[PDB]
Structures are given as structure tokens and as C-alpha cells.
Amino acid sequence: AVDFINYHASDVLETSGWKSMVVSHPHLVAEAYRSLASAQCPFL
Amino acid sequence: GPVAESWCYTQIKVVKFSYMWTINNFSFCREEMGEVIKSSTFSSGANDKLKWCLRVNPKGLDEESKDYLSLYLLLVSCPKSEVRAKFKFSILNAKGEETKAMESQRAYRFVQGKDWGFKKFIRRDFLLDEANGLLPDDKLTLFCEVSVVQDSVNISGQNTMNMVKVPECRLADELGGLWENSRFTDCCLCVAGQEFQAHKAILAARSPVFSAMFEHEMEESKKNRVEINDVEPEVFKEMMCFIYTGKAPNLDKMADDLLAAADKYALERLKVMCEDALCSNLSVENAAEILILADLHSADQLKTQAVDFINYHASDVLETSGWKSMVVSHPHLVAEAYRSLASAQC
Amino acid sequence: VSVVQDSVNISGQNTMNMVKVPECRLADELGGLWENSRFTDCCLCVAGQEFQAH
Amino acid sequence: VKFSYMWTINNFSFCREEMGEVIKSSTFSSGANDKLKWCLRVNPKGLDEESKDYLSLYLLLVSCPKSEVRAKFKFSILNAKGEETKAMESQRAYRFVQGKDWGFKKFIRRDFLLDEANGLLPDDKLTLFCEVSVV
Amino acid sequence: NAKGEETKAMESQRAYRFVQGKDWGFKKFIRRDFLLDEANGLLPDDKLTLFCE
Numbered sequence: 187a188v189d190f191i192n193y194h195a196s197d198v199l200e201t202s203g204w205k206s207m208v209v210s211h212p213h214l215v216a217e218a219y220r221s222l223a224s225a226q227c228p229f230l
Numbered sequence: 231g232p233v234a235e236s237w238c239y240t241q242i243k244v245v246k247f248s249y250m251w252t253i254n255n256f257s258f259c260r261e262e263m264g265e266v267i268k269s270s271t272f273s274s275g276a277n278d279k280l281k282w283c284l285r286v287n288p289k290g291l292d293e294e295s296k297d298y299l300s301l302y303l304l305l306v307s308c309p310k311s312e313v314r315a316k317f318k319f320s321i322l323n324a325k326g327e328e329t330k331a332m333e334s335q336r337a338y339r340f341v342q343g344k345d346w347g348f349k350k351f352i353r354r355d356f357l358l359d360e361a362n363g364l365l366p367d368d369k370l371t372l373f374c375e376v377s378v379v380q381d382s383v384n385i386s387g388q389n390t391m392n393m394v395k396v397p398e399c400r401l402a403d404e405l406g407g408l409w410e411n412s413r414f415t416d417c418c419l420c421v422a423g424q425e426f427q428a429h430k431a432i433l434a435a436r437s438p439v440f441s442a443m444f445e446h447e448m449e450e451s452k453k454n455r456v457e458i459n460d461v462e463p464e465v466f467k468e469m470m471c472f473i474y475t476g477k478a479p480n481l482d483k484m485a486d487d488l489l490a491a492a493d494k495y496a497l498e499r500l501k502v503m504c505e506d507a508l509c510s511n512l513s514v515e516n517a518a519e520i521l522i523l524a525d526l527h528s529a530d531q532l533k534t535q536a537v538d539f540i541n542y543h544a545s546d547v548l549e550t551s552g553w554k555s556m557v558v559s560h561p562h563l564v565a566e567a568y569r570s571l572a573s574a575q576c
Numbered sequence: 577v578s579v580v581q582d583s584v585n586i587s588g589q590n591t592m593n594m595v596k597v598p599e600c601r602l603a604d605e606l607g608g609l610w611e612n613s614r615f616t617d618c619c620l621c622v623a624g625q626e627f628q629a630h
Numbered sequence: 631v632k633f634s635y636m637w638t639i640n641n642f643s644f645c646r647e648e649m650g651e652v653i654k655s656s657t658f659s660s661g662a663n664d665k666l667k668w669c670l671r672v673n674p675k676g677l678d679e680e681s682k683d684y685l686s687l688y689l690l691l692v693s694c695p696k697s698e699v700r701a702k703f704k705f706s707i708l709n710a711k712g713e714e715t716k717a718m719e720s721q722r723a724y725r726f727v728q729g730k731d732w733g734f735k736k737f738i739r740r741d742f743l744l745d746e747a748n749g750l751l752p753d754d755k756l757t758l759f760c761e762v763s764v765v
Numbered sequence: 766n767a768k769g770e771e772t773k774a775m776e777s778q779r780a781y782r783f784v785q786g787k788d789w790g791f792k793k794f795i796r797r798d799f800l801l802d803e804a805n806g807l808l809p810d811d812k813l814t815l816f817c818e
Contacts, residue, residue: 232759234634234636235633235660235661236660237636237637238638240638240653241640242639242640242644382653389661
């Protein structure tokens, strides 16, 4: 699911469920950022 | 070289653009001759209304070139009529030095939609050879330098020249030298138990937040004593010096609390100069508290620059206990960091 | 099988225009306060017309 | 009645224009007498194709009260050290009118100027020293 | 001329590029004898009246 969110975040941040996750579950967004950090985006 | 009774100094202004342009996986040019790879538009700080772009044809533009790499420079937007310039291209090799450098000796004129360059720039076999290393890891790196000429101007240094010395406008130094004298101060002003004898007239003149606070039901009774506790005297005297003299020379040593006070007082110039001070001090260990102060003080540009710092140093900034504390205390900052590092970058 | 796609330009600009600072306050604020005409410390009547200053 | 004038052009290798163009300087005089205004019109290319490859330099009188002015001018170029070099002097007291120029068309070869070993173009800057005698 | 009508009018076809102190003209504008002949009427009252566009 973390991989899927990293893949399809272009709509997930628009959907309201991600906002609920941001509000209530800070650690989930932190762990998704940690996976997104050292993977699938380090070229720039 | 004797002394001249009159001299003149003719100054043709020149500005320099410097540009890098890297194509990944170049062997997948993916098409035949005539095709073009435009670059993103680029400029410098001044005037920033002239926008240039690169056109590179991987195959031959013409039937005479064919097995040739061709590049051109194209000017897309000109607020003036015409701009004269010289360009110089060079392919960076595997190590990074400039090779195959070709330039136009002529200061070509430029209009919107007009493009100039080298069709016969570098041989295709010479590029595609691996021994010269002109294509390291199928990455093509192009460095262009653009030199734009402007109008000449003469300062006319002929002598006798109104030979009295003209001082500049003296609003700043005259107001600055009155603080140590402490004259014309109608009221008192104490911060954190320390007295700083200043008056409300020039403060009301030079800070609209404070003046709007002054006219509303405080000057009738508590004009003489005003309660300020948000800053220490070392920040308050620096802000008072900035108000009177117009500058804050003691910036680097206390840039952070000066920025906090400036965010409190909506002093945009003080905020941006403290942000300029702190941008060069971006570091792995301090990035988390830098982000926290930027978010609290709504410095969007500093937030973006720190986001870029975290993007460039994501290998080590995350495991810092400061960033862990920022995670545990500020979910929104981590959410925005994820949004920027995901949507914009990839 | 390798499918190629339309390329995209990242469009970086190091140091760009920095923060694009607003107008100065060295002597503008004098003029802004005079336009707002507040803190009327005195009323000097000279040749009939009235002028205010500090 | 000796005027002296040290005129400096920077980034001259960006002469910025083609054959037969002009670059005017500032109008100058001395504190005495001060109503005879002069300006150097230099041409980075040749003025004419008959004598191409030349830095044709002229002296042009813009403001004059009288009908004519008799003057002798001497042009010179300072090198990297700063001494007077290529001192070309007009032997005659040439007559000047409002809107009239005199000078040396075959003043100096451009190829002779462009040698970096000669030191006649230091830091892409050229300094012209002109001495004018009005009789 | 004496009647004031245009005579010996000519123009350069190109749009010339002028700079600070650059001159462009016709060196061979008119025959001096054609000007000086009184019968042509081009020098009325010893007055040369010129027009420029």
C-alpha cells in the first residue's frame, strides 16, 4: 500500500482519505515519506 | 600618460548568461532527421525579460549535414526591438572539462523567433565514439555561454565639473545619530526591564502596525509605558536601529530571533534579509528547526529552499533526532514535504 | 521491449530571482505617513494655507 | 590654447557593429577658453574600402562662435604601460567649420592593433590621447 | 523651384541604420550647373529651398 501511494499520490492527496491520514495518523505519512525518500524519486 | 584636463569613459554594458543542459539516454533519440529537442527557457537576474532556449537536432538538420550534431540558440521573448549577442557552445566530456568549443565571432542580432547556431558543430561519429568519452553513460552535457551587449554610456569625466562636493540624501545618518544622543524623546520606552529612551512619533511614522496600535486607546493612558515582552533587548535595539538608520548590520549572529520578531511585526524586508542570512547556513543538523521556524514564520520561499535541501540530502537528514521531533510534533510539515518530494520531483 | 515516452523538462534555475523583495522603506514610509496625514503635531498657518509637519 | 583628451573604450573586441560605423565621444573643451566644443569620432572598422583594415580617427568641431578655427591636432594611443605610441600629428593648421571633421584615415592597421604581444590593446581597452593647439 | 514645385526629388530605397553621429546622403544629388542655371528656376532670388522627408 505504501508503494501504491508513492506511485499514485497524484490523486491520493486530492482524495479526502489522505487528509484524514494527515490529521490523525502523522506516523503513517512519516513512514510513507521515509519509503519515498530513499526510493523511486532519487535522480534529481 | 600625462594628466588629462578632460577624460571620458565609454562603457558598453555586457551581461553574461551561463547554461548547462543535460540529456539522459541520448541513444534513444527515438526519431529520424530534422527533429528537435527544445530546452527549458532560461535567463539571468537582470533584466530577466529576455528569455532564451536551446534547439538541438540529434540528427542532421540539412541534407549536407546528416551525420552531424547541430545546436542552435533561439530567443523567445524580447521586450526591446533587437538584442546583439555572442554565443559559445562546448560539450562537457566525461571528466567535465570543456571540449569541442565553438563560438561565433560576430555579435549576431536577435529578434523574437530568430535562431542562430552551429549546424556543423560536431561530427556524429566523433560524438558516438566511446574512446573520446564525449557521451559518458549516454548522457550528453552541453554548456553554453551567452554574452549580451547593451548600449554604451559615457560618464563625461571632464574636469571643473561643479567642483563642490555633493553629499547624498541625509535622512538616514541624521536619524541614526540622534539615538545615542537621545534627544527629542517625549516619552519613555522600557523593554524587559531595560530603558531605551525613544519617542512614538517616528516609530508611528516608520511602522504601520505600531501606529495603528498607537492611535487605538493606548496613547490616552499608557502612552508613557508600553508592554513589550516578545523580544530581548538585544533584538529590540537591533530592530530600533533598523527602524531609525535603515539597516541591521548585526545580522548573522542573531538572524533567527530577528526573523521571529520581523514575522511578528510584519517587516517583510527584515524577514527576507534574515532569510538571506539563513539560506547560506542550511545544514543537515539544523534543517529541521529551520523548517519549523520557516513554517511558524510563513516564509514560503525559505520553506521551499529547505524542502530542496531535504531533497538533496534525504540520505541523512531523516535519521536526525531533530527531524524525528519535527515528525512527531509537526505532521503537516512532513505532509507538505512528501507532497513536494513526490508530485513535483517524480 | 522498451517503450519510450514524451520527455519532460525539469527546468531548474539555481539562485533564480532569490525572494523578489518588495519596495524599499528607507524614505517611502515618510511619504506614506504624509499621505495618510496622521499624528497632526502642529498646525502652521502661513500665508493663509495650513501645513502640517513634525 | 592646448586641449588634451584621454578617451577610453572598454571591451572593444565587442565592437558590436559592422564596417563603416562610428562611436561618438563626449563633447569636450577646456576651462579656458570654453566655447569651442570638440568630439572624437573613431571608427573601429575602416571608414572606406579604399583604405580598409584601419582605425580611422577624426576630430570634429561641434560648437564654434567664429567663422573658422585654425588648429593642429595630434592623436596617440597608450599601450599597456601607458606611454604615447603611434603619435600621428597633423602638420598643418587645418581650418575647422561648424560640422566639419579632420583626421587620419590610415591611422593604424587593425591587424597591427589586434596583436596581444604588441600590448597596444591592454585588457580589451584602448586609450586615445589627443593634443590640440588652437591658434 | 520658383513656383515651389518639387524638382530633382530622390530617395534612398533602403531603411538606413542611424547611430549617434552617422551621416547618409547623396553625394551626387544635383549637377551644380543644373542648379546654377537661372532658366531651370532652381535658384530663385539666390535662395536654395530644400525639403527633406
